[PDB]
Design an enzyme around this catalytic site. Structure first.
Site, PDB file in Angstrom:
ATOM      1  N   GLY A 184       0.762  -1.243   0.000  1.00  0.00           N
ATOM      2  CA  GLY A 184       0.000   0.000   0.000  1.00  0.00           C
ATOM      3  C   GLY A 184       0.795   1.297   0.000  1.00  0.00           C
ATOM      4  O   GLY A 184       2.014   1.298  -0.137  1.00  0.00           O
ATOM      5  N   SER A 185       0.088   2.412   0.152  1.00  0.00           N
ATOM      6  CA  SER A 185       0.724   3.717   0.290  1.00  0.00           C
ATOM      7  C   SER A 185       0.606   4.225   1.729  1.00  0.00           C
ATOM      8  O   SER A 185      -0.484   4.301   2.291  1.00  0.00           O
ATOM      9  CB  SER A 185       0.074   4.732  -0.662  1.00  0.00           C
ATOM     10  OG  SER A 185      -0.054   4.225  -1.985  1.00  0.00           O
ATOM     11  N   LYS A 198       9.333   0.647   3.796  1.00  0.00           N
ATOM     12  CA  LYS A 198       8.588   1.802   3.336  1.00  0.00           C
ATOM     13  C   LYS A 198       9.548   2.655   2.543  1.00  0.00           C
ATOM     14  O   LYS A 198      10.482   3.201   3.108  1.00  0.00           O
ATOM     15  CB  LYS A 198       8.050   2.576   4.544  1.00  0.00           C
ATOM     16  CG  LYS A 198       7.761   4.049   4.303  1.00  0.00           C
ATOM     17  CD  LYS A 198       6.283   4.350   4.342  1.00  0.00           C
ATOM     18  CE  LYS A 198       6.010   5.597   5.126  1.00  0.00           C
ATOM     19  NZ  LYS A 198       5.562   5.224   6.469  1.00  0.00           N
ATOM     20  N   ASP A 210      -0.976  12.798  12.873  1.00  0.00           N
ATOM     21  CA  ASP A 210      -1.789  12.008  11.953  1.00  0.00           C
ATOM     22  C   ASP A 210      -2.199  10.682  12.556  1.00  0.00           C
ATOM     23  O   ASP A 210      -2.234   9.675  11.870  1.00  0.00           O
ATOM     24  CB  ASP A 210      -1.028  11.758  10.656  1.00  0.00           C
ATOM     25  CG  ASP A 210      -1.945  11.384   9.499  1.00  0.00           C
ATOM     26  OD1 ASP A 210      -2.885  12.160   9.211  1.00  0.00           O
ATOM     27  OD2 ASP A 210      -1.721  10.316   8.876  1.00  0.00           O
TER      28      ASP A 210
END
Ligand SMILES: OCCCc1n[nH]c2cccc(Nc3c(-c4ncccn4)oc4cnccc34)c12
Length: 264
Positions: free
Chosen positions: A17-18, A36, A129
């Protein structure tokens, strides 16, 4: 001593994924790891900073509920190596496959998440976040908070954004309190099994209203067995005026207390 991993060692497999700036993979470097990589070709001098941010924050975290940093690579590409967690993101469990945890499990996922966050905030780390997306259930019992590409000493998740953040009031809206609010939403995720504002189909609207104060998360939704105290603490973390929100030392103790009364 450094954690720079010598070129050629890291082995790169399934793409998964991102995450903030970059593409993540499951990989091999002394066993299963996640890689990552915030790159293709050569980087921006904008992304050069976000890489050097996450690697600089993560390398200051050593805790069970913070995702485990293993090292970083620059040499073939810019990459952060962390442990690997078979399992998923709390977001996945709640909103894609619809796992249905007992309440006691939920309250725990909550307590661990709080614990982790508390760790960061003591080390004067601000996550900026936190969101069900970035909370990992490792083999479905241990939480590891992840993605520190924005941490501090074309995109948006807003469903976790304090109002004060939704409207850029000055230079730093971000505070231990915006992190609290973010947290209270995943409290509300856990407890309702649903994302907030689910009946409004329009994003720009949600933004506007959650910023002005017109829209707030609906609490007449937290499933019937969710304790009063927990419902009460949720409501405390979601307060619109940031200065009325509990910091995490308090937030933690208060979930640890309603845990000793719940198995009854
Ligand atoms: O969007 C969520 C950010 C994930 C993340 N941030 N920083 C990382 C560093 C290494 C590995 C990461 N991802 C990891 C993911 C993942 N799965 C699906 C989509 C995105 N991530 O699953 C993992 C399991 N164990 C360790 C790390 C990760 C991440």
């Amino acid at each position: 001593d450094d954690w720079e991993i010598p070129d050629g060692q890291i082995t790169v497999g399934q793409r998964i994924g991102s995450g903030s700036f970059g593409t993540v993979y499951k990989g091999k470097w002394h066993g299963d790891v996640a890689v990552k990589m915030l790159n293709v070709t050569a980087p921006t001098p904008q992304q050069l900073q976000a890489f050097k941010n996450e690697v600089g924050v993560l390398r200051k975290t050593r805790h069970v509920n913070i995702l485990l940093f293993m090292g970083y690579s620059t040499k073939p590409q810019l990459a952060i190596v962390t442990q690997w967690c078979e399992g998923s993101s709390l977001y996945h469990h709640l909103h894609i496959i619809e796992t249905k945890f007992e309440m006691i499990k939920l309250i725990d996922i909550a307590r661990q998440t709080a614990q982790g966050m508390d760790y960061l905030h003591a080390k004067s780390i601000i996550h900026r976040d936190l969101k069900s997306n970035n909370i990992f259930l490792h083999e479905d019992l241990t939480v590891k908070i992840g993605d520190f590409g924005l941490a501090t000493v074309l995109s948006g998740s807003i469903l976790w954004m304090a109002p004060e953040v939704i409207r850029m009031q000055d230079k730093n809206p971000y505070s231990f309190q915006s992190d609290v609010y973010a947290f209270g939403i995943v409290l509300y995720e856990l407890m309702t099994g649903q994302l907030p504002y689910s009946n409004i189909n329009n994003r720009d609207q949600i933004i506007f209203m959650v910023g002005r104060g017109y829209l707030s998360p609906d609490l007449s939704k937290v499933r019937s067995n969710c304790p009063k105290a927990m419902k009460r603490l949720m409501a405390e973390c979601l307060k619109k005026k940031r200065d009325e929100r509990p910091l995490f030392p308090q937030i933690l103790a208060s979930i640890e207390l309603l845990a000793r009364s719940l198995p009854k």
